[PDB]
Amino acid sequence: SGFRKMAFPSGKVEGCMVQVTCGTTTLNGLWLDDVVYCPRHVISNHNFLVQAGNVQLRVIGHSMQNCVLKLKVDTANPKTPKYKFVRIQPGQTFSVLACYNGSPSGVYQCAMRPNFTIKGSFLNGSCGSVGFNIDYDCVSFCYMHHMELPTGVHAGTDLEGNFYGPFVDRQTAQAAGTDTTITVNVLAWLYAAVINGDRWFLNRFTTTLNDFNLVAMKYNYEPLTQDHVDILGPLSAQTGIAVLDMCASLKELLQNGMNGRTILGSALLEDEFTPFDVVRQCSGVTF
């Protein structure tokens, strides 16, 4: 029992965090094999100072790929895990290892919002902190922190330097678009509440995907697609509540509220747990 916002164990990523200094700028880098990846806004080889723990690494080459700077170093990281660079879609979740001066200070779980921002917890010096998922023993790097927007939200790139969202890496008038709730994730979290014995919000009603999408559009909820319904199949079979039956519960929570009640200790409808996160936490998958 219990439902927590759980992050992946960060150990395989901690062994890759280094400090990168170029002139007056100091931020974080990801050391994989003989390359250090970091935001290009950190800007010859000796101008780049790279520190891995107490050891100074020697930069022997440099190149740029989109908004990421790649510093070829002389030493391959002996702690390099099995890894892949993956680009995630909005709604997908990941763990963030927040670092300052190449030293990890915290780990949290979050989701890529539909407006491509992340509601993170970052201070000055956190640039170059990374987002990741673990699938068996392979680390899938999906995010590198670049900046904070005027509303306190964060923007960054995949590990190939491509920004998530209509953002650029520079000081200019940039604003996060109007955000929406990740519907498939709220539904998954309602199924996790049913698994943990919270059924007060269940009703005898069902709905059509068309009728529900008209309700979702009215409450700034992302449209629910047939793919989302198919993805919720296992949770529907485990609890005995059809996806459109759970959609009728969500419609009633949106039109009437919680009425002093909570779901999994929350008075808001939680949208940062994917259908896969719910299955993984309610099964004990290890890494």
Add this chain to the structure above:
Amino acid sequence: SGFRKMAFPSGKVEGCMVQVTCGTTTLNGLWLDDVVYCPRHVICTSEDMLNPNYEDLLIRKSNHNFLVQAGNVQLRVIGHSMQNCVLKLKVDTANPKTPKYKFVRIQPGQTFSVLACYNGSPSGVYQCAMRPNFTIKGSFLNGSCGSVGFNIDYDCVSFCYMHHMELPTGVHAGTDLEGNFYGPFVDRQTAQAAGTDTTITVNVLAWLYAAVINGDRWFLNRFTTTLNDFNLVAMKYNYEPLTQDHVDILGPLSAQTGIAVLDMCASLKELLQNGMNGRTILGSALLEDEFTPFDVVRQCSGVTF
């Protein structure tokens, strides 16, 4: 900017997780130097749990009855002893990944990170607090026994909790690393219930100061309160009494934001009275109590917005 429930990086603890098997029972152990620490109920069967005599069960065991697995490597047990509700298995190999560490016993209201494990393999990390009723609202399934709670201030890992059991309400109970339970609990399957839980007042206050640091002041009012009047009201909402120690501990945050602790207490009094009215504080519609004054100073900036 931003405020998240953040856990400590778990890498130093991952390198200590092992699997301990005694007969049919399989749970997690903490491998530090040449000792593996795990719940003593690993020597029990399900039947044994009603009234276990651990001394009688342990005396019938030998070293080779305890199987310890560290990754793909089998560790050899060369000795065993019991300290309160923890079993200590002396092994023939010191853990090369042993970090700098201490065993600390925490008080209610204190927070810590939990590395949840199954079969000696870590699966997730989360942040939580020791509730005033000594339970933890964790996320544990069968096989998670022996998972540990910790804080990592500087490079030293302070181990404060080892998971032992789930109570009938879905909450969890465990011990410090010396085997002493937190709360009036026993490692027996007896009628045990968590006491009535309360909100950690000093933590809610710290979180209100964190909201002021991040630029939110809608909840503040022009009133102050006496400490006693605050407690008379807060006790009616099932809030823990606020002591002079709590007020002293909130001193730095009070000086940083310019809001006296008893003025922040008046805002809390009013928040309990009125509710939120469709508003949120740091993206939350409830009053959050799992961030200590120390956590707020660590996560939030030194400059108030």
